[PDB]
C-alpha cells in the first residue's frame, strides 16, 4: 500500500492524463463528468467517481490510494453527484473507442509460452496485431489520435481519442468491432467463414501478414510439429476430405515432421492427388485454405467486452499491475513486455536520483506527452474548422 502511495505521489503522470481525458488544459465536462473507478487491496471496488481538476484528480487518487483505477464514459451530469439523481437521469455522452488484445488468445498456435506468461518470441503476435489494427484505424477509419498501452502482464490496449471516434454509440461501436473482428470463432476444427473474393481489408491484412507467416508460425512457434496438434488445428482448415485423410495417414506413418515440413507436405500431396482438368481449381482452393490459415493464425484477436459498450471501465494507463509489478506504460509496435518498467525499480531509481526524468519511465511519459500535444492540436483545429463551417 505504501509503494502505491509513493507511486501516485512521486511518479504517476496526472497532468498528461488529465490533458488527455479532458481534451483541454482548462477544465471541462470531459473530466468533470467522466466516470472513474477505483480497485483496492481489501477487494473493494467503487464506481462513479469524477474529478473537477487535475489537482482534484491527483488529490483524490492519492487520498484513496487504490491498487489501480479505471476510466469510463463522459456523462451528461457529474458521476460523483449520482446520489442527487435517479439511475435513469445519469447518461453517457462520449468515450474513447478502446480495443483490447490478449496473448492468451493465441495459445491455439503459441508454443514458447502459455497462459498469462509472455516473452519476446510470442509478442510478435501482438506487434503484428497492432500493425494491422493501426493500418485499419488510419486507412479505413481515418483516425489519428490514438495510442497503445501495455496491460502490464499479457496484452495491449489501444485508446482511440478522435472526436468522431469518441462520439460512437454502442450500436456503432459493435459494428466497428465487427468490421475489425475477422476471426469471429476461435475454435480450430473448421475453415474460416470468410466469403470470397476478399474484401479489401482482408486482402491488405493478408498481404501484410504473409511475410511473417513462415518465420513466426512455421519456424519460431512451430506448433504443428506435434502430429496430433496438426491433425486438430491445421487439417480442419483444408477444403477436401481425401487430402485430409492422406495427410493424416502420411503423418501417422511419418511422425514429428515440423510445421514447415507439414506445410510443404500439404502442397506435395495435393499435387499428387488432384491431377487432371480440375487441377487448377484444386490448386486455387488449396491456396485459399492456406491464405485463410495465415489469417486464422496471425490476424488480431480481440476482447469484445472492452469495445462493445461505451460505459465500460478499463485499467488506466500508467497503472501498476498487482501481480507482476509492471507499469501499464504506453507502447508501440516495437515493444516487448521485458522492456516495461516496474514499481520497485522505479522506487529504487527515484531514491537514487530524486527526479522522474532520470528514471526508466520518462521515455514512456515522453511518448504520452507527444501524443497529448498532437491530440490537443487536432482538437483545437477541429474546433476552428467547426467554427468556420458554422460561419
Amino acid at each position: 500500500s505504501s509503494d502505491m502511495e509513493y507511486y501516485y505521489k512521486s511518479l504517476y503522470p496526472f497532468k498528461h492524463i488529465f490533458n488527455w481525458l479532458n481534451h483541454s488544459p482548462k477544465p471541462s465536462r470531459d473530466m468533470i463528468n467522466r466516470e472513474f473507478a477505483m480497485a483496492f487491496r481489501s477487494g473493494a471496488y467503487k464506481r462513479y467517481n469524477s474529478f473537477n481538476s487535475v489537482q482534484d484528480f491527483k488529490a483524490q487518487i492519492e487520498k484513496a490510494n487504490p491498487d489501480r483505477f479505471e476510466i469510463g464514459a463522459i456523462y451528461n451530469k457529474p458521476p460523483r453527484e449520482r446520489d442527487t439523481l435517479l439511475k435513469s437521469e445519469l447518461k453517457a455522452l462520449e468515450k474513447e473507442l478502446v480495443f483490447d488484445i490478449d496473448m492468451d488468445d493465441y495459445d491455439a498456435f503459441r508454443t514458447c509460452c502459455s497462459g498469462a506468461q509472455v516473452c519476446s518470441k510470442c509478442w510478435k503476435f501482438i506487434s503484428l496485431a497492432m500493425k494491422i489494427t493501426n493500418t485499419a484505424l488510419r486507412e479505413d477509419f481515418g483516425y489519428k489520435d490514438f495510442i497503445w498501452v501495455f496491460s502490464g502482464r499479457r496484452g495491449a490496449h489501444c485508446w482511440v481519442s478522435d472526436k468522431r471516434a469518441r462520439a460512437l454509440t454502442d450500436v456503432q461501436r459493435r459494428n466497428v468491432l465487427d468490421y475489425v473482428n475477422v476471426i469471429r470463432d476461435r475454435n480450430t476444427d473448421k475453415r474460416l467463414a470468410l466469403k470470397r473474393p476478399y474484401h479489401p481489408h482482408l486482402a491488405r491484412s493478408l498481404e501484410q501478414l504473409k511475410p511473417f507467416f513462415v518465420s513466426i508460425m512455421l519456424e519460431e512457434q512451430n506448433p504443428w510439429e506435434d502430429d496430433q496438434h496438426a491433425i486438430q488445428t491445421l487439417l480442419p482448415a483444408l477444403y477436401d476430405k481425401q487430402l485430409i485423410d492422406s495427410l493424416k495417414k502420411y503423418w501417422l506413418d511419418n511422425p514429428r515432421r515440423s510445421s514447415k515440413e507439414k506445410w510443404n507436405d500439404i502442397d506435395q500431396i495435393a499435387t499428387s492427388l488432384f491431377k487432371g482438368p480440375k487441377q487448377d481449381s484444386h490448386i486455387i482452393k488449396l491456396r485459399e485454405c492456406k491464405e485463410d490459415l495465415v489469417l486464422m493464425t496471425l490476424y488480431p484477436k480481440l476482447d469484445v467486452e472492452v469495445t462493445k459498450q461505451t460505459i465500460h471501465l478499463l485499467k488506466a494507463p500508467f497503472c501498476i499491475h498487482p501481480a507482476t509489478g509492471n507499469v501499464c506504460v504506453p507502447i508501440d509496435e516495437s515493444f516487448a513486455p521485458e522492456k516495461a518498467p516496474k514499481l520497485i525499480d522505479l522506487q529504487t531509481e527515484m531514491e537514487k536520483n530524486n527526479d522522474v526524468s532520470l528514471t526508466a519511465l520518462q521515455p514512456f511519459i515522453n511518448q504520452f506527452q507527444a501524443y497529448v500535444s498532437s491530440l490537443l492540436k487536432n482538437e483545437l483545429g477541429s474546433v476552428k474548422r467547426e467554427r468556420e463551417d458554422d460561419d
Binding site: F141, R164, N175, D178, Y179, P200
Partner: protein, 258 residues
C-alpha cells in the same frame, strides 16, 4: 416548323401520393368523421400488429411481404389513385402518431413497425418510382476518376454482392454491371450496419456504397424523422386533451400493444 401556343386539400393529397410513398411530411387540413378516425386507425394498427408479430416470429422480408400484401386491398390500399385510399393511409398514420407518441416503448414499437411497412411498400415500387420518390425527398456520387482509381477495391467489395443479391454468377456480367454502376461516398458512421458486415469499402473515414444498395439510409431517415416527430407529438399532447371523444379511442388503440 409548325407550332401551337376544398380543392386545395385534394390537390395536396394528389401531390403527396404522386411518389406513391410519403414521409408523411405535412399537416392535414379539412375534416373527416370520428368513425373514420377510429376505423382507419384500427386498420393500420392491424397491419402493424401483424408486421410486429411476424418479426417476433423471425420471418424474412419475403415471407412478411407474402403475408402483408393481401391485407392492403382490405385494410390500407397502396399503389392507388383513389383520394379516399390516400386520405385513409395518411390520416391513419397521423392518428397512430398520437396513439404511440405517449411512451418510449410505444414510440420504438411504432417506429419499427412503420419503418418496416415503409420498406415493404418501397420494395413494391418500380425503379422509376423509387428514383422519383428519392429525388422528391431532396436526398454525393463519386467522380469517374475516383471510381477508376478505387476500381479494384470497389469491385472486390461488391463482386460477391453482385453474385448473391443480383444473381450475377458470370464474372463477365458482373464486370459489365460494375462498369455501369454508380457509387456514393459518405462518412462510415452513416452506414455502420453495412460496415459491420463488410459490405462497403472504407477509406479515410468514408464508406463507398453502390447505387443498387443504400435503402437502409432511406428507411433510417424515415425512422429518425418519425421518431423526432413523435417526440414533438408527445410535447403537445396537452392540446389533444381538449377533445374527450378521442381519448377512449387512443387508449383502446394503445391497449393492444401493452
Amino acid at each position: 416548323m409548325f407550332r401551337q401556343s376544398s380543392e386545395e386539400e385534394k390537390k395536396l393529397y394528389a401531390r403527396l401520393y404522386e411518389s406513391k410513398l410519403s414521409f408523411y411530411d405535412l399537416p392535414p387540413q379539412g375534416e373527416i368523421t370520428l368513425e373514420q378516425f377510429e376505423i382507419w386507425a384500427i386498420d393500420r394498427l392491424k397491419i402493424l400488429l401483424e408486421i410486429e408479430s411476424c418479426l417476433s416470429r423471425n420471418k424474412s422480408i419475403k415471407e412478411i411481404e407474402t403475408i402483408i400484401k393481401p391485407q392492403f386491398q382490405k385494410l390500407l390500399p397502396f399503389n392507388t389513385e383513389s383520394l379516399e385510399d390516400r386520405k385513409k393511409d395518411y390520416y391513419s398514420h397521423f392518428i397512430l402518431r398520437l396513439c404511440f407518441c405517449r411512451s418510449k416503448e410505444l414510440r420504438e414499437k411504432f417506429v419499427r413497425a412503420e419503418t418496416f411497412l415503409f420498406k415493404i411498400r418501397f420494395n413494391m415500387l418500380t425503379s422509376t418510382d423509387q428514383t422519383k420518390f428519392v429525388q422528391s425527398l431532396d436526398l454525393q456520387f463519386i467522380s469517374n476518376e475516383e471510381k477508376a482509381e478505387l476500381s479494384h477495391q470497389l469491385y472486390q467489395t461488391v463482386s460477391a454482392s453482385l453474385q448473391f443479391q443480383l444473381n450475377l454468377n458470370e464474372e463477365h456480367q458482373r464486370k459489365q454491371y460494375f462498369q455501369q454502376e454508380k457509387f456514393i461516398k459518405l462518412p462510415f458512421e452513416n452506414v455502420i450496419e453495412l460496415v459491420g458486415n463488410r459490405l462497403v469499402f472504407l477509406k479515410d473515414g468514408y464508406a463507398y456504397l453502390p447505387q443498387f444498395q443504400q435503402l437502409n439510409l432511406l428507411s433510417n431517415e424515415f425512422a429518425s424523422k418519425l421518431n423526432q416527430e413523435l417526440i414533438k407529438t408527445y410535447q403537445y399532447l396537452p392540446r389533444l386533451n381538449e377533445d374527450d371523444r378521442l381519448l377512449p379511442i387512443l387508449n383502446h388503440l394503445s391497449s393492444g400493444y401493452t
